[PDB]
Amino acid sequence: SISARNSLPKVAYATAMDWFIAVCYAFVFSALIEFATVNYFTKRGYAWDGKKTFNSVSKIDRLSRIAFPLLFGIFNLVYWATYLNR
Amino acid sequence: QNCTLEIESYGYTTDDIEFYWRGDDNAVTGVTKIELPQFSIVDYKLITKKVVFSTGSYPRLSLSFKLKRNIGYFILQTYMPSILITILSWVSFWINY
Numbered sequence A: 001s002i003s004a005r006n007s008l009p010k011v012a013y014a015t016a017m018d019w020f021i022a023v024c025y026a027f028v029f030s031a032l033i034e035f036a037t038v039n040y041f042t043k044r045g046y047a048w049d050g051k052k053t054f055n056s057v058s059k060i061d062r063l064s065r066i067a068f069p070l071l072f073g074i075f076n077l078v079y080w081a082t083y084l085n086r
Numbered sequence B: 001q002n003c004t005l006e007i008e009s010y011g012y013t014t015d016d017i018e019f020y021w022r023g024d025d026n027a028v029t030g031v032t033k034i035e036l037p038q039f040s041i042v043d044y045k046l047i048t049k050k051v052v053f054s055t056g057s058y059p060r061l062s063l064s065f066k067l068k069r070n071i072g073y074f075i076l077q078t079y080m081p082s083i084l085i086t087i088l089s090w091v092s093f094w095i096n097y
């Protein structure tokens, strides 16, 4: 985001690339907040040994394996179709 | 900011030349249609005065602007990444000790 705001004049408004950068910042944070929630809801300090009560695969992990890539895919079909046409 | 242009006569004193704005405030035109990318001209003011140097007293017309800086570029570049990188620092309170 810092390096992309170079070699262009210091305009007051926000360009389309700045909107793409905000959405990507959000998708990289919501992912970080999702891991923070998983670590808040974690339990034991030992993982699976492959062979006691062990930890389970998080439901927030299994939902974000699908919801996060599709919501980025929906954004790309919206953003690139709107500005390439304009 | 307050940026000035200092119009003055070099060799002729006030006994040899006299300066005035022709048209009072309707002497500097086209200021309102100037577009700057990061500034905005709030006001402009025209001053007629005399300055006294060692060799005599010389007439002077002073043209000046009042540039105000736009904020949203600095919000987009400096303030909001620092805010987000500060929000990132308090994620560490939720991770176990």
Ligand SMILES: CCCCCCCC(=O)OC[C@H](COP(=O)(O)O[C@@H]1[C@H](O)[C@H](O)[C@@H](OP(=O)(O)O)[C@H](OP(=O)(O)O)[C@H]1O)OC(=O)CCCCCCC
Binding pocket: A030, A033, A034, A037, A038, A041, A042, A043, A054, A055, A056, A057, A058, A059, A060, A061, A063, A064, A067
């Ligand atoms: C940025 C998104 C933030 C969402 C925050 C959402 C926060 C929220 O609601 O968390 C609750 C729950 C946590 O589930 P998760 O699987 O992570 O945690 C399990 C859950 O707490 C079980 O109840 C536990 O079993 P038990 O009862 O102790 O026996 C189990 O312990 P163990 O059996 O392993 O020992 C835990 O591992 O998540 C959802 O239901 C999915 C929400 C999906 C929401 C949408 C996500 C995209």
Ligand SMILES: *[C@@H]1O[C@H](CO)[C@@H](O[C@@H]2O[C@H](CO)[C@@H](O[C@@H]3O[C@H](CO)[C@@H](O)[C@H](O)[C@@H]3O)[C@H](O)[C@H]2NC(C)=O)[C@H](O)[C@H]1NC(C)=O
Binding pocket: B002, B003, B043, B044, B045, B047, B049, B062, B064, B065, B066
């Ligand atoms: C930007 O800065 C300049 C210089 O600091 C400002 O010019 C100053 O403007 C004031 C207000 O007009 C002047 O005061 C006036 O002086 C006359 C002199 O006869 C007097 O009759 C008035 O009653 C009043 O006191 C001041 O002289 C002038 N400065 C100089 C050095 O001449 C200017 O206002 C600032 N702002 C803008 C938007 O330009």
